[PDB]
């Protein structure tokens, strides 16, 4: 009785800039799927139940697009045929430049979330960050998206 | 040349299709081969704005007075609250649709 | 059936009274499966090891008392007359802000595995409680599952 | 029958300064091992599989340490006899203080990560923080390292 | 139902161990609470039914702190300022951090 | 005190050692009693830099133009990519012995 | 590149001879019939990999006047590593490791 | 013919890659006499003892951010006899810090020399830990050489 | 025709604290002697002629007057050491702040058979030994 | 015979005239062997590659030094920089610092090398052991 | 002690040889031929005067990290000259703060 | 068992021993079988303070006015200059440097 689990890793394709969700690697390096699928950025549930889902995104930059006004949103969202809108699950807000000055412009910060949610067969979870320009991809170890059934 | 699907007002249940529930209502029991979808109203504090097949309603947002905010529109079973500025406050950041934080006038 | 719970930040969520944060247990994302709840606490029914977690969303329109925030998970047990700290974080956002009057946001997450006996309780505390920014249950929450 | 789990806590000897991993307490207080073991800072896997691994480190300081790099990592690493270097698994990059930080105030910042990884028998996981001078040890509740099979 | 000096273990109400002592073996209907002293570096300050002692806090020299009271089996350590340092952030009875006096 | 181990050129499979694959390749199949270790080369965008018993190659790092960087050496089977300043940029942030961000000339 | 020896060998003239184990240096190079003759690194020195070196690497010292002591001693196959002396805490960093410790006040 | 070389600072010297410095080998003051060059390295043809040397000019306006407390300038051997570079001759400097007035120019030159044994096919390179400190000009201020003794 | 040359490296016995010269390693690691000898800190000349001699010493410390770093000749022709090549440097601050500074000297001097060259540093406690690569002493005939 | 020379700072070493430093060629540790000297310059006789070096002792009682080696040749009407260092020397404290350089250069018969220091006032002459200038063929 | 050559020639062994124009180096020295052959300086080098040099002089680089750019580029007859980048002012030109 | 050696006032030449020269003089020519050590005075700017077998004299030290120093004792063929403070000047750091009031 295999327990569903997955870990997907930041990829060179990861940031579409389309306003769609982030995409993720599923097969290479540290990424894998066990009893879950993937579709267009989404972990797709096969087996219904309660899943701990989690994501980390590594942020950083040389200054911010908006100065001390800049705000980041990092979230996990459910897509389901039962509703025609995406539903927020777990969301964080950060003020990434809040401590920066003009002579201290370069910054790095990670955002992590996790939580247990109920998912039916055929439902999907995706990760979204606004603004994607602050995501600093490296090699799949700094940004990632996963789940396992509990 | 498309493929068949649930109608807009239906949702999947196995390989079948069941009718969606109305706004402000959630599914209590799925439809069966004789039986219709059984819907029940969203308890207070929650809403669902559209036809749905959800088992649970959506939590209404609170408008944070410490953020200089107040409800433009209270929550109801069919609609989320909308937040805007309190009297004596101006919006300092929009979040697209709505306002996120307001400051006083001194 | 493996116990699990996810509790969401609530209208009530802040008593203000030196008591812990309060949470919603049934509406929306919130649920209890084989755990119970009482006055802010997840209450354990089946003894074992649990991963407990909490996220709280902090923020403010600028910065007015204490610059240091503590966000913690704590155990209440009839085995000891004080709450025991389990997993705790400290944060300083206002202390180091370049502008005192800017809107700011910061999210605090923690989790870990702890051992819990039947009848033992876990609560969440934040000081100062007024830095917690409630919305709709997606940004501040409290959960657990047995591992 | 017994699902492997562990939780290891910061302790007086956690910060060796040797370029090696953090060490941890494994028995006293909140620390335990159940079906995992410990060796020089590592959780040692005995039963192969997929594990959620996590670590928290409490950072902070009075002012900012001299000569601190611009970027600091907090990460989980795999040691395996399949490779003579450690493999990065899950890493956060942060800039917790610098030049512009006031010499005179106390700052605090906590770093959490988690994720699921595949581990064979005999493989190990360790935690590293690039500059240990930022770690603020207390009593085992602010810095820690754990895992459980999923 | 347990009185003050007892605590619940399964179906039973068991006597608590004294400060400085931990429950090595819970009481059964037939055998008593077995209390053992906390090992070094840990403590329990009250009558208790804990299987594990509380870990004592370390006073961090890099924060300008030392132990003004050492950890013992019944009492957590308390921290105050190191010599040549003064308090800049205060908690309850102790400091959370001290800075050094400047010199010429 | 250590346990007995395989040679610097071998790696454990169960209770025995097997030979390690060369840099640039990963293990496709382990020794048997009478099978050599079958190695397979690293796929694009991955690398392994040493003799190894790894089932999966290591992911190559990306050099971010938004940080003023480009690869001064491209990922190869045996070697990770390495980053340098983009043309018209100079290094302004260091990570250990190497550059982590570059700034454009004014 | 140029034609090279295998990983467990090193060049002697225009040929290749087998490398010595970690902890050992080359005492005598290989001939056609005769293998590489190796000998253990003297105390205070190390060699951490298969090697074709004629001289061992010197181990680093950990300077107590910088508030340091060896947390791991020099051995034949491994360099010493430095950590804080008792009653000292790290105040200076060199990359991932401590370069100086200060005594408690 | 006694082997000798002097290589000089050039616009490609500072790669920021964590590799060694690169050098000009033919133009101006640079030359190679019975030694070769490859990716920053002086490559030895005739085995023996060589005096090797390097100068790097450091300087700046202010101090680069996040500068380490210990900066090294050194000469290192690459040999097929060992899979890592071996340190030959290295200096530690602390050229500037967060206190350094960001309103003025500082300069400091680092020089080292020594005799080492090199076999045929061995290589010597120069590294500086933090290349942002290095102030290239025209080949007169930073350089790398060797001659057999 | 074998040209005398030597390179001697910092060692754990290098700093005697006795007022005498620094001592050095002569055989292990990167150290060697070729047509020169060694005795109690000194390179001892067998073949008379002009030598380029050199020393590097790595100095440093945490917080903290003048440092002196010198090469000196001992000769039976004079009851005292002759200063040959010498440098003075200022030390050093936060007393939490490390400083480092390397001192290099080189030059050509005439040496007869049986004459000796040594290295001295004052104050010896500011020398930061590591692994033989930071502080060293050598020569070759030119 | 392999050419070589070591020249020592001396009482005349700093002219204060905008010309190069001068040096002693015969007394104490100074000597010339197959090289000549002329107004501060080492003068080459036998053409080829030379390691040239100079040390200058800098210092002061309270308060950009350039220290350089330069080529004079009838092949060009200006001095050519060979090897040059910059140092930030320096309120009210005593300080010392030594500048050393060396390197291999090609010199033709008749060509000259000199040493300059700006500002010359910062050079602290003592007895020829602390500031010097030399070369030898390699 | 006299120069080997009159002002406009330079010594090459026993002989006195004609010089080469700015921007050119001596490719083939006088010897069997009474005359000199000159060839252009390669890119990145210059020679600014009448000369008997076998190698051109390396042009200086202007350091952006010091707030400098070339106000005059390097050419065969002239070295680059450095001045401030846009928005900077000379502090020493050898360095430029904003 | 002690070993043979030049006398105190002699110095080694080859396998043999020659007499040293007086302070203020250097060996111009080594002693021979029939001939004495030939010595010659040290030129101005140099000294030698003891009997010696040196081919060169030691260079006298200069006293740097710019460091607030004057010669208290001038240099001579047999002793080195010694420096102290100039008038209107007192020692900070023999004094290596002095201040004007
Ligand atoms: C929401 O409810 C409260 C009290 O029930 C009322 O006073 C308020 O005006 C309502 N707000 C709006 C915008 O309808
Ligand atoms: C705490 O205990 C230590 C350990 O021996 C002792 O040296 C120290 O003086 C004690 N401090 C106090 C305040 O009692
Ligand atoms: C690396 O790859 C690209 C093609 O993808 C090529 O244009 C570029 O020049 C290569 N870079 C290097 C440094 O070889
Ligand atoms: C390293 O060596 C010393 C000297 O023998 C020894 O006493 C000490 O125990 C060693 N240190 C460690 C941590 O083993
Ligand atoms: C030393 O000699 C100088 C120069 O001739 C002379 O003027 C001075 O008076 C003398 N001073 C002493 C102290 O001998
Ligand atoms: Cl990544
Ligand atoms: Cl609901
Ligand atoms: Cl919320
Ligand atoms: Cl802790
Ligand atoms: Cl307990
Ligand atoms: Cl315990
Ligand atoms: Cl693997
Ligand atoms: Cl070797
Ligand atoms: Cl050795
Ligand atoms: Cl240069
Ligand atoms: Cl050393
Ligand atoms: Cl001098
Ligand atoms: Cl020429
Ligand atoms: Cl002599």
Residue numbers in the entry:
A (entry chain H), D (entry chain G): 91 to 240
B (entry chain K), F (entry chain J): 37 to 142
C (entry chain I): 92 to 155, 158 to 240
E (entry chain L): 41 to 144
G (entry chain D): 38 to 142
H (entry chain A): 92 to 240
I (entry chain B): 91 to 154, 160 to 187, 191 to 240
J (entry chain C): 92 to 154, 161 to 187, 193 to 240
From the paper:
HVEM is a TNF (tumor necrosis factor) receptor contributing to a broad range of immune functions involving diverse cell types. It interacts with a TNF ligand, LIGHT, and immunoglobulin (Ig) superfamily members BTLA and CD160. HVEM engages in bidirectional signaling, serving not only as a receptor but also as a ligand for IgSF receptor signaling. To dissect the molecular basis for multiple functions, we determined crystal structures that reveal the distinct HVEM surfaces that engage LIGHT or BTLA/CD160, including the human HVEM–LIGHT–CD160 ternary complex, with HVEM interacting simultaneously with both binding partners.
Mixing equal molar equivalents of hLIGHT and hHVEM monomers resulted in a single species with an apparent molecular weight of ∼100 kD, consistent with the formation of a 3:3 stoichiometric hHVEM–hLIGHT assembly in solution. The asymmetric unit of the hHVEM–hLIGHT crystals contains six independent chains of hLIGHT and six independent chains of hHVEM, which form two classical 3:3 TNF–TNFR hexameric assemblies with threefold symmetry; a single 3:3 TNF–TNFR hexameric assembly is consistent with SEC analysis. The hHVEM ectodomain is composed of four cysteine-rich domains (CRDs), while hLIGHT forms a compact homotrimeric structure. In the hexameric assembly, CRD1, CRD2, and CRD3 of hHVEM engage hLIGHT via surfaces contributed by two adjacent hLIGHT protomers. The two independent hHVEM–hLIGHT hexameric complexes exhibit similar overall structures with a root mean square deviation of 1.8 Å for 742 aligned Cα atoms. The hHVEM–hLIGHT recognition interfaces are highly similar within and between the two complexes, and the following discussion is based on the hLIGHT G and H chains and hHVEM J chain. The structure of the hHVEM–hLIGHT complex shows that HVEM CRD1 and CRD2 domains interact with the DE, AA′ and GH loops of LIGHT, while HVEM CRD3 interacts with LIGHT CD and EF loops. The interaction between the hHVEM CRD2 and hLIGHT DE loop appears to be important for hHVEM–hLIGHT recognition, as it contributes multiple potential polar contacts. The main-chain amide group of hHVEM A85 (position numbered with initiation codon = 1) forms a hydrogen bond with the side-chain hydroxyl group of hLIGHT Y173, consistent with the behavior of the Y173F mutation in hLIGHT, which significantly diminishes the binding of hLIGHT with hHVEM. hHVEM N88 does not directly contact hLIGHT Y173 but is relatively close, and the hHVEM N88A mutation attenuated binding to hLIGHT. The hHVEM M98 backbone amide group contacts the backbone oxygen of hLIGHT R228, and the side-chain carboxyl group of hHVEM D100 forms two polar contacts with the side-chain guanidinium group of hLIGHT R226.
